[PDB]
Amino acid sequence: ADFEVHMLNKGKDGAIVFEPASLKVAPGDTVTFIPTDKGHNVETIKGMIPDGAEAFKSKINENYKVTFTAPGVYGVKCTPHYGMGMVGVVQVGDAPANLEAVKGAKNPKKAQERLDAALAALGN
Numbered sequence: 725a726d727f728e729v730h731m732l733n734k735g736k737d738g739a740i741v742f743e744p745a746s747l748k749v750a751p752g753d754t755v756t757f758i759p760t761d762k763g764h765n766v767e768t769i770k771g772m773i774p775d776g777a778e779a780f781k782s783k784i785n786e787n788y789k790v791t792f793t794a795p796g797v798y799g800v801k802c803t804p805h806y807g808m809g810m811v812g813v814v815q816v817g818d819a820p821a822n823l824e825a826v827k828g829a830k831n832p833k834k835a836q837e838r839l840d841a842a843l844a845a846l847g848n
């Protein structure tokens with residue numbers, strides 16, 4: 725199945741968001757990051773992908789389709805808006821095995837709050 729994640733200047737959760745900011749998918753699902761508002765991209769947060777997963781980094785304003793396979797949690801960011809909170813989490817499968825690695829990482833406050841909220845939304 726394919727899911728869109730919109731890259732927004734503002735959304736349901738306020739300024740500079742991925743919407744949704746949390747999404748649970750199955751292996752083989754795709755997530756298409758939509759540049760609905762200009763100036764955004766999506767990138768995995770280094771240290772926040774599961775064992776053996778490929779990192780990814782899109783271009784600014786690129787419509788970017790990712791196929792998620794390895795189970796676990798994937799922390800994502802928008803590079804230009806990372807520190808002020810434009811982050812999210814894609815979870816592949818149940819009981820993500822890399823959860824503690826993701827939780828333990830340091831981030832700027834606004835990014836951390838949004839990562840933590842996404843992890844909690846996903847039942848972690």
Ligand SMILES: [Cu+2]
Nearest residue numbers: 764802805810
């Ligand atoms: Cu952005």
